[PDB]
Design a protein around this ligand. Sequence first.
Ligand code: HTJ
Ligand code: CA
Ligand code: CA
Ligand code: CA
Length: 433
Amino acid sequence: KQLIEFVRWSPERAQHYRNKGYWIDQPLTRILTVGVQSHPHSLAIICGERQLSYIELDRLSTNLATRLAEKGLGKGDTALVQLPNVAEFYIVFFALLKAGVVVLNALYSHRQYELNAFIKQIQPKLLIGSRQHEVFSNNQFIDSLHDVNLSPEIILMLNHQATDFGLLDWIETPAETFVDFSSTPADEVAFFQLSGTGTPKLIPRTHNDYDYSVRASAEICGLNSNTRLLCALPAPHNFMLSSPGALGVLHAGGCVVMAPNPEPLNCFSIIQRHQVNMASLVPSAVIMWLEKAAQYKDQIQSLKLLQVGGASFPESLARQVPEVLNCKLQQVFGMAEGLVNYTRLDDSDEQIFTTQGRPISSDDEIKIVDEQYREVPEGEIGMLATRGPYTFCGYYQSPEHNSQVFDEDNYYYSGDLVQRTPDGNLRVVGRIK
Ligand SMILES: O=C(O)c1cc(-c2ccccc2)nc2c1cnn2Cc1ccncc1
Ligand SMILES: [Ca+2]
Ligand SMILES: [Ca+2]
Ligand SMILES: [Ca+2]
């Protein structure tokens, strides 16, 4: 009956973050509950031909939660989920949040090796995947787990075979018998994020810290109930999920519009069809869009805001976003470990085109340090160290690595090389291995 173990914030910091109104001690399911009360029939998710309202998202995720609870899956248990960019990803995410099951969302691009590693670490009693994924093409992988005593109690499959438990069947109808269930407490783990050598590391995220980053991001990006956000990046990625991502849009009462990937022609027609007004991309995908955008200018006119995060996004490329994609640019530099930086919507051109913005929170603390861990003079390049109301305090079950990436004041060293501009924004300059 024990809850998942994780490294806590110091009580003085926890109190401060409550005093500031950052941590409001609500489960992530708050996003749905509130949406259902205010606008139950407005669209929450558009996926291909499907239109899921707020109340449908709520009903369906409740259905699945009741069936997991009926099977004795709840607080103290974990789940591994691997689904593509479809509405069922969010139905499942909210169901597990409701049931108090700590979920790890694998990327759909992850393979047997990553999945095996994730299973050993969290020992999930629930596994949800797709029969269309290579790893679940046959039963070779599933059988291998019995051999090592790592078989989950329940396996659900999207695109199921006749002898599978069908994910859609566990979603469409509630359980026959009532068993009590609830979310994990708000200052306890809700789910595992993944770091971005070796398999990704597990980042425990609490309801308090994740909800805060979501609510605060939604305000920064000016989301509202008319927001239609394209979800073309992997749905589980911190960027696509929380920055402000699908959760941010749901928090603001808007609609998520799914796309399987960032391929421009398909994305452009989805943008046109649903009048998408916001999208989020990495630089390699921005380039692809730029190459087709002149010719398909008509299809993408409705875009009002494009977020770009990730690799290297030089000024000359950034300036092409408003020029060619005919929308405002926002640069985003974040990490699944916590800290996210945004250029603001009212920042100057120079800030927007040449920087990766500034932190969500006035209580995001940042040190920029040299090789001897001394704070560099203002404006100079150094290694980023950070802590704040939504930055984690250690990887899951990883005390040795944690000791190497945190200092005594619990600052996290991300490996990023940055400099603070005279205007107050960060410029990401490189990485230390
Ligand atoms: O440092 C990076 O390499 C990086 C990769 C990706 C990314 C996002 C989706 C898919 C693939 C890569 N996104 C990035 C990266 C840096 N900032 N961002 C935006 C971001 C925002 C929030 N949380 C995490 C990342
Ligand atoms: Ca519907
Ligand atoms: Ca536009
Ligand atoms: Ca133009």
